[PDB]
């Protein structure tokens, strides 16, 4: 499967910055997901971490790392302040919530 190293790894790469975004290219809803947080919410993209993971060699260890990490298999997969948003629906549910524009308001302090 994945080394609890790659995980380990991968759960730092996640701690990095205060928005992550594990995506792919030809994603519609990686970019979807990209556009509503940069876009739409205006989320410095200083404080983000957009990994393309088919841009990357380690890309589907990654994405492996990622399922291991959270049980999500699927791109775009979100985490802020290092911790779990989900895909796209989970964003998109936590934008129209309101929950969202509190989760990410530390981004902004």
């Given at each position: 499967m994945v080394s609890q190293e790659t995980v380990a790894h991968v759960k730092d790469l996640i701690g990095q910055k205060e928005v992550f975004v594990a995506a792919k290219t030809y994603c519609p809803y990686c970019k979807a997901t990209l556009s509503t947080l940069?876009?739409?919410?205006?989320?410095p993209k200083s404080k983000a971490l957009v990994l393309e993971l088919d841009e990357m060699s380690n890309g589907s260890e990654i994405q492996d790392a990622l399922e291991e990490i959270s049980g999500q298999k699927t791109v775009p997969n979100v985490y802020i302040n290092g911790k779990h948003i989900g895909g796209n629906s989970d964003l998109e549910t936590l934008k129209k919530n309101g929950k969202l524009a509190e989760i990410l308001k530390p981004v902004f302090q």
């Open positions: 940069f876009q739409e919410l205006n989320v």
